[PDB]
C-alpha cells in the first residue's frame, strides 16, 4: 500500500515522492527525474548511513512512510 | 594530508560516529569518510557543496 516518503535534494529542498513499498530504488530514481530533472544516473540516494542500490526495494531498507532520503548527484560516466 | 577534512580523523580509521566507514570523492577532489560528508550535506540547507573548497558537489564514482 502507498506511502510518503521525503526526499532532500541537491538543491537544498525537501520534496516528498508517492511510492510503495516494493517498487524499485531504479522506480524511485525515475520518479525523483520527474520532478528534479535529474537523470537516473546521475542520482545517488541514501538513507540514514545507506546508500541505496538499484535492484533493490524500499522495502528491502525497511524505508517507512515519511522516511527520510538524501539525494545526491552522481559525476556523469 | 591523510585526515578526514571534516572530522580531523585519519581516513585509515573510523569516522567520529563509528564498522564499516568508506571513504567518498568529491569532484573537487576531496576525500572524506562517507558518513561525514552524508552528516555535512544532511545539514545544508542551500546547494549541496563541498565544506573545504566550498565547490558544487558531486560524488565521484
Ligand atoms: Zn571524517
Ligand atoms: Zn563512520
Ligand atoms: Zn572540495
Known sequence: ?77 | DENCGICRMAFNGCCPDCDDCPLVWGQCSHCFHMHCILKWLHAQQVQQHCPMCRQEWKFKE
Not at chain 1, 540514514?48 to 560516466?77: C, W
Open chain 1, 1 to 77: 500500500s502507498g506511502m510518503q516518503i521525503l526526499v532532500k535534494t541537491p538543491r537544498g529542498k525537501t520534496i516528498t515522492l508517492e511510492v510503495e513499498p516494493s517498487d524499485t530504488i531504479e522506480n524511485v530514481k525515475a520518479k525523483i527525474q520527474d520532478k528534479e530533472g535529474i537523470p537516473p544516473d546521475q542520482q545517488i540516494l541514501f538513507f540514514a548511513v545507506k546508500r541505496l542500490e538499484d535492484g533493490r526495494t524500499l522495502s528491502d531498507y525497511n524505508i517507512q512512510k515519511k522516511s527520510s532520503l538524501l539525494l545526491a548527484m552522481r559525476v556523469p560516466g
